[PDB]
Design a protein around this ligand. Structure first.
Ligand SMILES: [NH3+]CCc1ccccc1
Ligand SMILES: [NH3+]CCc1ccccc1
Ligand SMILES: [Cu+2]
Ligand SMILES: [Cu+2]
Ligand code: NA
Ligand code: NA
Lengths: 621, 621
């Protein structure tokens, strides 16, 4: 029978559109802001498939938006409810709104006055469509607002990011098509130099010194793809999903240990990311973009070109999403899958036995790349031969710019003459619905323990470890402690290895700084997840995002801080780990005019999950 | 003219032997415990080469050892001094002593009594030749001692590590050939299971699922090697050295930025490593092995097999060292050099300009692998296209074992029935003699700064950075602070980029735990470097190792804590950064019977060193 974890197909999306149409929910004034398949319910699979899709529907004529779930299998509406967005949050930004901010401002007298003072041709002024957040403007409550920051393009192929127009910001109601405010705090020179990284004047002559590196697989890859998205590779099994909000998600990560298929992670995703800015200028002090929750990173996934984006023997998935009208849209070559050599796996040359042994490692890679305005991110999941699981985000694109003030700044870096880059962070939340050997799991926080020289430790060399079980959600909001080697172990207290110890996996964080904003800020309330490194909740099918379902213009407190208050039992239960991890970015000159990739991530390693090394059966190369 | 940074050649070593012989310093009772070329003096190179070699000479007849420097160019002894080892430390362990401990014990009545009580055939009992340290045994002061721990080999190809003989340790004087102590604290069962990772009974049938991954370079590599060890690759220039103590060392790391060859690091090496054990049992509580300083990791560098150890288009160096008699000995294929693809370098798809841009990264890799008893380590240096420099250590081999006590342990992990693995750390010191744009350098510690919501930061979003210059050595012993994003910037205060800011590089640590032992322990005094993450000293040619020159059986306080007390000026001077970084290892079942690689390291990234991205001239793939 068909797997309930298969990717949405074009025909399923069309059937959703048809169901909504027949139900009276998708007339010509409606736009789909989000649409995605839902995961099967726990315990389903008893020969009764029910593929459900969830949809957020916007109305361009001013009516209230709706959240709808349909059964594509049964042709039915499961639920449909109108949303009061002043309470629940606005819907995600629509792609069609990316152009609207500039269009509305181009005929506004106040905007034109600001541009004329600066001798800027309106036809050359791009306006970034920036999420608004919630600040002191009471008139915005319940309205769908974007804010606009201007960047000059000297010609149509020019990089506008080189030419920010500082001192100017505008706010627009994208439904009533009105400009609510135009704030001009003062003229700043528009930085003069271009940032055109394909112009020979700036690149100089291209180097001719790189000789080819050829990666091939003469017998093809060692993984198989069946059922469209089910991967089998080197003992691992999983399904690769794709959601317009989250991007690539991994389901049913399991490892075949002899004859048993042993679950490890039920669902892995990046359930939110946020980019908070640290410049106190009123032109930018409101800026915090939730690329996942506000913009939907899957929607903007790039088509990945062979030889350029993914090198070697690549197998692609081309996931389908909905356009704004409910028609299917394929993202051609949007997901790369391939295996890579990964150096030495294990090596020992033994003087006493005379045996010399070396084995090589490899990893399975599942990745996509997305672009939301100036920034571009690659999301990479890795599975290693030895049972390690890793995620890595690769941040690149063009840094968000400003003017560089006269006389310097404590909150902005200089990149070029007169050109600044405000300080900011990129903070991710990985939602790991755990299933270590099945669903009965618990988390322990493990710290190194230093011991005092004295009785029982007379030479002062001993050290130890302590593990603390997180028993209820009230105790499951944790912070890093790099100095004490803090990690978190997810174990199954009812499944023991051959040494009579509970099987587990250990989460190794990078221990980067968490959200720096003041705890009384709007962003600290709207991105509360980002203030702590590790959260553990009891699984609930509707607790999907650490920021809640409607992030755009939500006033704060949604998501994890609300979920956790239920104080549910997490000691040997079906649980979800939410790991916050991020990059703090004080931009450097080398990041301009296009940023070399920088990375952040985390990994999980088996910890007494196996009865011995799981890679003793790897052959000599 | 010949480069003074070239590798030692066989003929140079023979000439050292000849000079020592003619000078009366290398008769038949002498053994060379260490021999290596010295680096050129600052300001040399004025058409007056003087290749000097330093030698530590042991005497098997009981005479005092000597430290000698010769000029191989001039055929002269520069200096020769007898060492009082009770003050200065003993010489490094000799390879010929690896067999001596077992040999001496095999005829000792007390050792035979201990083995007979356990029904162990002496012919099957291997004895590890373990460094002694300095504890409470006054009779050891000034004597060359090794300690012995026993492991049974059931047959000559058996992995003895599976069969530790706990409760038993012996101490031997390897010069007088006497057994000073045999301590038998009680019988423990010798763990029964084997650990033979090539036995099909334990591996099971080898997997047949791995299909080949072929990495080739049809036009050869993009780097050149001239003068034996001078590398030019993708703007980088450096010389690859090899010392019997440190292993691979990198000299004169520089980057060609347009027409200027800009120095970055004058010398990079791993100047010490130490493995302290955290089991308070008297059988092991003395155990701390300084693989670099006591054993000499270069001496044990492996010959690296193509296709197995180094994959792709590999260029090898085969460095020469001295045997115990001063004859040259080549380590065939001991150093791998190759370039690797490294994913995406930079990527942006711009809605407004319509330009889609992707470039790939690559890295140059210079590596070696070494084996000292049970453990094997790979040392990898990486140079990236974008100016980043990285080091990574890969730890593998077989974990050091013990019995697993009845009734468990706070300081030992269980690996198999009755088989334990004592807790321990692997702690490295990278000595980075800096030369950021030349030798006039300084270090700043940079922390993130959180800001309070209030006047000038009304939305509570601002955050900043603070840099503190380390002005003198008295202020240059620093610890990590992961929570505040702490890094260290090495800059040249007299060399500014085009934006009028000092050029620099930023050191990014992993912020792993430092030495856990009590501060009053012997190991905390002998490995004081390991107690703090970052030290900065003023360059001095004789300050080579963070532990001093003679680590074996030195009583404490040598090296960095002594150097730093000079309180020299480091604010715009020729300085050396010593970064401590390590892995804390609570062994897991998966580490047995042979350990999958685990890693630790650090990286340095340019920080306003360049005037813009240094990779704009990279072509499309
Ligand atoms: N990344 C979401 C914010 C954004 C959207 C469009 C242009 C610039 C920035
Ligand atoms: N690694 C240095 C210590 C050592 C030496 C020989 C056998 C086992 C351990
Ligand atoms: Cu950034
Ligand atoms: Cu270890
Ligand atoms: Na779960
Ligand atoms: Na220096």
């Amino acid at each position: 029978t068909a797997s309930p974890f298969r990717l949405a197909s074009a025909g399923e999306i069309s059937e959703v559109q048809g169901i909504l149409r027949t139900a009276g929910l998708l007339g010509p004034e409606k736009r789909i802001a989000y649409l995605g398949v839902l995961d099967p319910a726990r315990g389903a699979g008893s020969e009764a498939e029910d593929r459900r899709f969830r949809v957020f529907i916007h109305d361009v004529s001013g009516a209230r938006p709706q959240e709808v779930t349909v059964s594509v299998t049964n042709g039915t509406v499961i639920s449909a409810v109108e949303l009061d967005t002043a309470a629940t949050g606005e819907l995600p930004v629509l792609e069609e709104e990316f152009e609207v901010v500039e269009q509305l401002l181009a005929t506004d007298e106040r905007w034109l006055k600001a541009l004329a003072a600066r001798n800027l041709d309106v036809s050359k002024v791009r306006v970034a469509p920036l999420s608004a957040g919630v600040f002191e403007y009471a008139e915005e409550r319940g309205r769908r607002i974007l804010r606009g920051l201007a960047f000059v393009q000297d010609f149509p192929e020019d990089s506008a990011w080189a030419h920010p127009v500082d001192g100017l910001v505008a706010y627009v109601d994208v439904v009533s098509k009105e400009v609510t405010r135009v704030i001009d705090t003062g003229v700043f020179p528009v930085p003069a130099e271009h940032g055109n990284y394909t112009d020979p004047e700036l690149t100089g002559p291209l180097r001719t010194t790189q000789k080819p590196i050829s990666i091939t697989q003469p017998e093809g890859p060692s993984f198989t793809v069946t059922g469209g998205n089910h991967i089998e590779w080197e003992k691992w099994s999983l399904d690769v999903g794709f959601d317009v909000r989250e991007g690539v998600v991994l389901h049913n990560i399991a490892f075949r240990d002899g004859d048993r298929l042993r679950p490890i992670i039920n669902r892995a995703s990046i359930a939110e990311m946020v980019v908070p800015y640290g410049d106190p200028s009123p032109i930018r002090s409101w800026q915090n973009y939730f690329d996942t929750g506000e913009y939907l990173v899957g929607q903007y996934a790039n088509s990945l070109e062979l030889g350029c984006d993914c090198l070697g023997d690549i197998t692609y998935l081309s996931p389908v999403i909905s356009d704004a009208f409910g028609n299917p849209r394929e993202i051609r070559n949007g997901i790369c899958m391939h295996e890579e050599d990964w150096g030495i796996l294990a090596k020992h040359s033994d003087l006493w036995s005379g045996i010399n042994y070396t084995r090589r490692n490899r990893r399975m890679v599942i990745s996509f790349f997305t672009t939301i305005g100036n920034y571009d991110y690659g999301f990479y999941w890795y599975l290693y031969l030895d049972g390690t699981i890793e995620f890595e985000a690769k941040a690149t694109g063009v840094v968000f710019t400003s003017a560089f003030p006269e006389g310097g700044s404590d909150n902005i870096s200089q990149l070029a003459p007169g050109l600044g880059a405000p300080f900011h962070q990129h903070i991710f939340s990985a939602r790991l619905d755990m299933a270590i050997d099945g669903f009965t799991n618990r988390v322990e926080e493990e710290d190194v323990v230093r011991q005092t020289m004295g009785p029982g430790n007379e030479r002062g060399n001993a050290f130890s470890r302590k593990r603390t079980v997180l028993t209820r959600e009230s105790e499951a909001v944790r912070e890093a402690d790099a100095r004490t080697g803090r990690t978190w172990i997810i174990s199954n207290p009812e499944s023991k290895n051959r040494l009579n110890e509970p099987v587990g996996y250990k989460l190794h964080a990078h221990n980067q700084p968490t959200l720096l904003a003041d705890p009384g800020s709007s962003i600290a309330r709207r991105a509360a997840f980002a203030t702590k490194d590790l959260w553990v909740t009891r699984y609930a099918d509707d607790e999907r995002y650490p920021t809640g379902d409607f992030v755009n213009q939500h006033s704060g407190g949604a998501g994890l801080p609300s979920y956790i208050a239920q104080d549910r039992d997490i000691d040997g239960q079906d649980i979800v780990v939410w790991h916050t991890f991020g990059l703090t970015h004080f931009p450097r000159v080398e990041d301009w005019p296009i940023m070399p990739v920088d990375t952040v991530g985390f990994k999980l390693r088996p910890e007494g999950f196996f009865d011995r090394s799981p890679v003793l059966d790897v052959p000599a190369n």
